[PDB]
Amino acid sequence: GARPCGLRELEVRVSELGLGYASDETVLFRYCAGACEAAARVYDLGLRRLRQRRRLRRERVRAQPCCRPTAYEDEVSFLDAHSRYHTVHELSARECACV
Amino acid sequence: RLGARPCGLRELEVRVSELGLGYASDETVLFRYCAGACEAAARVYDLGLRRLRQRRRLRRERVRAQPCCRPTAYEDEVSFLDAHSRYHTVHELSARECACV
């Protein structure tokens, strides 16, 4: 439990993705999930202190690392409704990191 | 909120003391950071990820299904003189570049 930020796999039906595809054919879906406890960055620390001090302009400021894809899979093909092989691009994460 | 302002680089003059990094310096530095809205919106990966989270198919993990305004690059270093005339170097203090991750 509570594992670090990394690549995750899950077999899904294309219809389950909520992309508007009728097909029930399965595709392997890859995604970034996990924890970002790689010690607070000097940038993040400085930002949090300035944030509580009302020094920062009233705006949405993220002073915490995010587990997100740094690269995406080029393409995934599945048989669609019109029975043609349809390609969806950048569906799955290829690489993950804490940004 | 429509028209909140896109994710981008922001600059503000600060004393090194204000950062709370433990340095005994009153030197003014230009602090560069990433702030703003990230309404990408609806990247196929994000749309699929949000939908799978609704079905509770993601193993209970944290999962970040939305883009974040974060630095993609950091300024190499900041150098200053503390009160006791001691030279200090702070690495990766400022954002060099921003993006919706």
Swiss-Prot record, chain B:
Q: Which GO terms describe its cellular component?
A: extracellular region; extracellular space
Query: So where does heparan sulfate group get bound?
Result: 53, 62, 64, 66
Q: Name one GO molecular function term.
A: signaling receptor binding
- Give the domain of life: Eukaryota
Major location category of this protein: secreted
Entry annotated with the keyword Signal: yes
On whether Signal is a keyword of this UniProt record, the answer is yes
Q: Name one GO biological process term.
A: nerve development
Oligomeric and partner information: Homodimer; disulfide-linked. Interacts with GFRA2 coreceptor and RET: forms a 2:2:2 ternary complex composed of NRTN ligand, GFRA2 and RET receptor. Also forms a 4:4:4 tetrameric complex composed of 4 copies of NRTN ligand, GFRA2 and RET receptor, which prevents endocytosis of RET.
Which family, according to the similarity comment? Belongs to the TGF-beta family. GDNF subfamily.
According to the entry, the disease involved is: Genetic variations in NRTN may contribute to Hirschsprung disease, in association with mutations of RET gene, and possibly mutations in other loci. Hirschsprung disease is a disorder of neural crest development is characterized by the absence of intramural ganglion cells in the hindgut, often resulting in intestinal obstruction.
Record function comment? Growth factor that supports the survival of sympathetic neurons in culture. May regulate the development and maintenance of the CNS. Involved in the development of the neural crest. Might control the size of non-neuronal cell population such as haemopoietic cells. Acts by binding to its coreceptor, GFRA2, leading to autophosphorylation and activation of the RET receptor. Heparan sulfate-binding is required for signaling.
Q: What is this protein called?
A: Neurturin
Q: Which organism is it from?
A: Homo sapiens (Human)
